[PDB]
Structure 1
Amino acid sequence: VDGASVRFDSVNLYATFFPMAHNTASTLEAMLRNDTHDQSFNDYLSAANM
């Protein structure tokens, strides 16, 4: 009602990679591409809010 609001001017995405030898990054990528093992996470709260 009284105060003003924020005003975005520019947004950028930053991302830092671990500098890893291409010899072993290909191997790690080869493993993670396998069907047997894939990342799996669960919400910490893990609840259905009503």
Structure 2
Amino acid sequence: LYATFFPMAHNTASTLEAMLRNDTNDQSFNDYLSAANMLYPIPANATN
């Protein structure tokens, strides 16, 4: 597993950390496709 870290100044990283540990500053994301996926069978030669 590889991971690259921005060589951020330690006093700066510390400040950012403190701010980000606040629930108010919680990060949040959404899945791009954003959907419930469903598959329904269509027997051969079926039309409806």
Matched, 1:49 2:37: yes
In structure 1, distance between residues paired with 2:25 and 2:8: 21
Gaps of 5+ in 2: 39-48
Gaps of 5+ in 1: 1-12
Structure having the higher Rg = 2
Structure 1 or 2: larger helix share? 2
Q: What TM-score, normalized by structure 2, do the two folds share?
A: 0.76
In structure 1, distance between residues paired with 2:37 and 2:12: 43
Give aligned-pair identity as a percent: 97
Residue of structure 2 in register with 1:6 after alignment: none
Structure 1 or 2: larger strand share? 2
Q: What TM-score, normalized by structure 1, do the two folds share?
A: 0.73
**CA positional deviation for 1:37:** 1.2
Root-mean-square deviation (Å): 0.5
